[PDB]
Design a protein around this ligand. Structure first.
Ligand SMILES: Nc1ncnc2c1ncn2[C@@H]1O[C@H](COP(=O)(O)OP(=O)(O)O)[C@@H](O)[C@H]1O
Ligand SMILES: Nc1ncnc2c1ncn2[C@@H]1O[C@H](COP(=O)(O)OP(=O)(O)O)[C@@H](O)[C@H]1O
Ligand SMILES: Nc1ncnc2c1ncn2[C@@H]1O[C@H](COP(=O)(O)OP(=O)(O)O)[C@@H](O)[C@H]1O
Ligand SMILES: [K+]
Ligand SMILES: [K+]
Ligand SMILES: [Mg+2]
Ligand SMILES: [Mg+2]
Ligand SMILES: [Mg+2]
Lengths: 523, 523, 524
């Protein structure tokens, strides 16, 4: 009292109303037949939209309690979108479906801990069914279909990503850069990606991107654990007139050594970063000289007879742009060399025929692909900059979904996946009636996505849900045409990772929400 | 309680009310015998305009939801005006007629999606008859009549436009410039129009014109895909003391080179733009040298032996003004040459006697017209600058409307065209009762313009509407004189694109209003 | 008047609030450590009571949807008392528990009707099991104990009830009334007596005693008014020759006749006294025939056409002695024939079997007791009237409890009976899983009485309830001493009738109420 503090049921019922108001604004846009929501634009001509994310972002309820219910749901929905490139609205709608019955059933006096345990049991079991249902992402055709769906059925995006994957292979690194002009373009350049990131948070980027990138960086290739960089300072000072950044790749990023010294080298006013070389031992040596050829640098070490005092601006590698995150780095376009790379790749290829000792065979057979086909760079063109930004975002999210799909396969989309597994878990039961109500509420929510999508079409949801449950395999309702058919033949594919993630996160909040007992907020 | 978020009928009912206040303010002005609207002005002496556009501007409702209902209708009306030079109020009236009946039927619980589908069916069917009713703009008299009706019966404007088109021909490019004095003037100068615009948004103009124009521009006529402009900076720097702009017209506007380098050339402080030469290959060559003669330039290319290092300010063309849009370019008046053009045109005409090969016949037979009649420039004279500004604006709309009429012909004005097709489609029926009522709503709305015109005139709409439906052909009611007669002989003509466009846009909003479910607006 | 309507959970929550508000007011009285409730009555001093039904009847709530709940459960609290007297508090606690747990299961989405049938099945089995546990009660020690327990642990009341039921026998009728001493008193009446005194003081032969006593008197029963001495002469003549005294029973004695007897008595010609007939109406005729039977006399009445002028010494009844007070008449050792008296008793007992009204039925028991047993009066002693209505109510409830005990047996008190029967039904099942829940909800609620008894003491309820279920037989928890033991050795006994009654009526109401879907009532 006397502050907006309240306890027990008086708290929950405020949240319930908050979540419900948010959800009613989102679910109406779910699927391809979303029905318009109007958002006020201060200048007039209010923007008319069919996008869940664009709607859910605007809502800032004025009641300080109802706001919180909205924000925590919005929050988790966004995190599911970061795990996989879609499903913001799916997670939101599922969250309403579970939470609604959860808060009512607790208000009837059920034990909230048993409800939590019951929901968690059902969701944990269901995830195992998805693992059995998933099929591998067999071909670039599926890549295309996954792409379009992620892009509101924009075919064009899918062809680019499909084509890009054809140049560099499904697993190859793809990057997107702003439009050179009216029309899209695709090209390949001698980049270099490896699975090492920056080890210190102070190497964070200036923008909030989490990953950091350096433009026109020099590349130091120090093939030892670097106990001393003082002999590099004259080179940095000669570069300091230009300010050109330095990225460090090291056999080890020795902490009290080079890493500390680099951290001391900048007061925020020097562009430096450091990462380990990829692999271990001879692999770091090998890929350090690979990067040297790719960047036009040389390997630094005393065993090579190459002190940092000797390191000219051409013994250091160089690249036009490079990106680093918490765990990963990619060179996009090293200045590099032509014939030296061709010869080294041929030598590495020859080594594959002899370095067949299993884990050594790998290092060769990746490194050949590390040099050749460095990176493909999509250029996004549109009639105006407004569409260019829009298209770019669409492409970038579409890209993510495709990667998620190829990493963990696809399942029949359009909500059939959830309604399918719901039939198989129906026999599951808990230790007591509280858990049984927990189990039932979980399986009730799993049907909500299909029922919502169809209802938007202007259809009787009851008939379709029965028909899809009575069917078998990937038989389902194609909302885009009102025809029934096989989703895999129809190309309605959802990446398994987004569906799994959207379920787990929604259930986490619902369980997390049940066990809230007090809030402390300002008047 | 909450932010002003609200759903379903509670939202729609607000929209309906907002739309109605707007339409009732505007619809009373429709037709040549409108009724006065007293627009307020803070200085006193209110303006009392009869102009629907002027009234539509000010309407700005207090109640946020009521406001939104007005603004979206207002917006779509404006888009209709940009598509064709009239029909703002016609589109508004049709919008109100559909919306009102639509929302009523929805509130009764009619399936909203089925209602939409019904509307779009009738509109799609109806346009086919309008296509059939169109007739060619055969003669300057039809030009004039379309003009006057577009200019509130100002015969002056129709005469001016008629004369200008008689000078340069219907297809020829015409421009309007501020008055040189008390009296209107018309004259011709060596302009050149071709349907190529600037390929990058960063060449957008400073004002909001969308198109961009350059005054006293220099013209580069580069007959290759320009992979390198570095050799031009010395010429541009020599010009930078005067700041006279340079336009690049290229055989190809090379994307990653020419465009990127040009983009890099200006930091918002250099007047540079680039466009493709018209046609392909030898066509671009031909018209490039045409432009060269018209501008006093020369063709740039290594095969010609004219590097940009060699390109003086007289190998570059010059003009006093040039205009560029998203899809089209015209030079207004190149500095050019006299006898060189005359000899060139004569040669082209001679080539027409031998360029019988059709891909040449079409490439030759235009270029002759490209030289002669380059542009006509109407000067609008008036007794005051206030009348000047208003008058020019009207002339510009009459210009737009005339182009529309020549593009898609004309049909009987005064609502006769809509009420005619409405009678033909009375047999049209849909798959179910929800779609059937949807059809009835659309066919009723299409009659609204005629009944609104006559009602403003202070006559009995029942009798006139029945008489026009009992007639045949272009028979109709002349509101300016209350005589019945053949509309075409009285010159009451509307460009078909105006009627076609206004109907489709009204339907689109009406369809889009039925299927809205939620609002978001600030407190 | 305009109605208001509510649906679904928005109705049941309001209803549940009402029942709980009533039930908590009753609950607090339960068990030996329960506490008193103060009842406002506008006429005068408020009355404090422990009787659960007394409070429950007075409760009514302002909010209509809350009031509906109280007004329904009020029935169980009342009906239990009407049926069996004691045990109304228990019935209430059960009802609230079943409603709470039943409605909770409905929130899980179970079909309500299947819960109802499940509960009804569980009670039907449990009542049958109680018939197995019940053991006969007949000895004076057990009756004394069950009296004490119902009295709220007053040994004195128990002892008085045990002696009273012994003296008047099983057919005798016992009644309780407001006394005047500080200490309780028992009055016992033997033989026929009725509340009519001598019509004149001058009959008084023992003025120091203030009463008339007559030896071996003739008893004349005239079904008519005495108005003219002409009617009486032959009987007086015959009795005067016989010399035995005569008592007149008549509808009235007119002053002329009355004064003539007064002269004859004062002058010592005939010893005679006259009294009004008891009661009035047809019951007067019945009672006249009954006293006639006890005396072996004959009722002279105009309906049979008999005449007092024709009555004979053979028609009058006889008794060894009579005594009549200012307000009371008693007849000692009527010469009526035992077999005829017994046959008359059988006829009236057949009327008792036919008696549709328990109040009328009681007046018949009074008659059979007056004819063939005794009647006793218990006078409650206390210093102030608020103590009268306190003590009075508890003594009253003991009287009902002991009756039900002797006529149906006893079971271990302290609610342990319900605990021990509930465990036996663990294997009972219904036609479907919803009925299985309905069964389990019923067996769960049967623990509620024990949990409340303990909780009033401030002990931890769920530890006692667990440990009692760990035992076997009559092992239970004695709240008075806070020790475990065999309930029968402490004599903590409940008469099976009340327990069985409380269960059936509780489940009958609650098992319906949970099915409520809509409630309609006037706007406030
Ligand atoms: N042609 C289609 N038929 C049926 N369902 C579709 C079709 N295309 C997409 N969907 C479904 O739309 C859902 C996603 O809708 P969307 O508006 O992207 O919400 P979110 O952004 O939260 O994923 C997915 O479940 C997807 O399978
Ligand atoms: N003499 C006339 N008789 C009948 N209708 C006319 C006449 N002149 C113009 N109109 C009609 O007026 C309508 C447009 O009115 P206007 O005031 O221009 O509104 P808007 O500017 O929105 O078109 C056209 O449909 C046109 O055919
Ligand atoms: N000494 C005792 N120990 C434990 N339980 C007792 C004791 N005396 C009475 N009880 C129990 O308390 C209840 C009687 O209390 P009472 O206030 O009369 O409630 P009710 O009005 O429902 O009979 C019975 O269940 C009886 O078995
Ligand atoms: K959508
Ligand atoms: K007008
Ligand atoms: Mg999506
Ligand atoms: Mg107009
Ligand atoms: Mg009791």
């Amino acid at each position: 009292a006397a502050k907006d503090v309240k306890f027990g049921n008086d708290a929950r019922v405020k949240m319930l109303r908050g979540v419900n108001v948010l959800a009613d604004a989102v679910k109406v846009t779910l699927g391809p037949k979303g029905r318009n929501v109007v958002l006020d634009k201060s200048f007039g001509a209010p923007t008319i939209t069919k996008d869940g994310v664009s709607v859910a972002r605007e809502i800032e309820l004025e009641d300080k309690f109802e706001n919180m219910g909205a924000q925590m749901v919005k929050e988790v929905a966004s995190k599911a979108n970061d795990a996989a490139g879609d499903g913001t609205t799916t997670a939101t709608v599922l969250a309403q479906a579970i939470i609604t019955e959860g808060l009512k059933a607790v208000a009837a006096g059920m034990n909230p801990m048993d409800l939590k345990r019951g929901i968690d049991k059902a969701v944990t079991a269901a995830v195992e069914e998805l693992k059995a249902l998933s099929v591998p992402c067999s071909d670039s055709k599926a890549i295309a279909q996954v792409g379009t769906i992620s892009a509101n059925s924009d075919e064009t995006v899918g062809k680019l990503i499909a084509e890009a994957m054809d140049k560099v292979g499904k697993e190859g690194v793809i990057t997107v850069e702003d439009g050179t002009g009216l029309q899209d373009e695709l090209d390949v350049v001698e980049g270099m990606q490896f699975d090492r990131g920056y080890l210190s948070p102070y190497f964070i980027n200036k923008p909030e991107t989490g990953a950091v990138e350096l433009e026109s960086p020099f590349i130091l290739l120090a093939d030892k654990k670097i106990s001393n960089i003082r002999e590099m300072l004259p080179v940095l000072e000669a570069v300091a007139k230009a300010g050109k950044p330095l990225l460090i790749i090291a056999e080890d990023v020795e902490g009290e050594a080079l890493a500390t010294l680099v951290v001391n080298t900048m007061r925020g006013i020097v562009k430096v970063a450091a990462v380990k070389a990829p692999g271990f031992g001879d692999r770091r040596k090998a890929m350090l000289q690979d990067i040297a050829t790719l960047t036009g640098g040389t390997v630094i070490s005393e065993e090579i007879g190459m002190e940092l005092e000797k390191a000219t601006l051409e013994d250091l590698g160089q690249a036009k742009r490079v990106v680093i995150n918490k765990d990963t780095t990619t060179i996009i376009d090293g200045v590099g060399e032509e014939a030296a790379i061709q010869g080294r790749v041929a030598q590495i290829r020859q080594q594959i025929e002899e370095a067949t000792s299993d884990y050594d065979r790998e290092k060769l057979q990746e490194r050949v692909a590390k040099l050749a086909g460095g990176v493909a760079v999509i250029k996004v063109g549109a009639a105006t900059e407004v569409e260019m930004k829009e298209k770019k975002a669409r492409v970038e999210d579409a890209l993510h979904a495709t990667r998620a799909a190829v990493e963990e396969g696809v399942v029949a989309g359009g909500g059939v996946a959830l309604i399918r597994v719901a039939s198989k878990l129906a026999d599951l039961r808990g230790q007591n009636e509280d858990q049984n109500v927990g189990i039932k509420v979980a399986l009730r929510a799993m049907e909500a996505p299909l029922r919502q999508i169809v209802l938007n079409c202007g259809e009787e949801p009851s008939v379709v849900a029965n028909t899809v449950k009575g069917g078998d395999g990937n038989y389902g309702y194609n909302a885009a045409t009102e025809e029934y058919g096989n989703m895999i033949d129809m190309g309605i594919l959802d990446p398994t990772k987004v569906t799994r993630s959207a379920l787990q996160y929604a259930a986490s909040v619902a369980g997390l929400m049940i066990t809230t007992e007090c809030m402390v907020t300002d008047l």
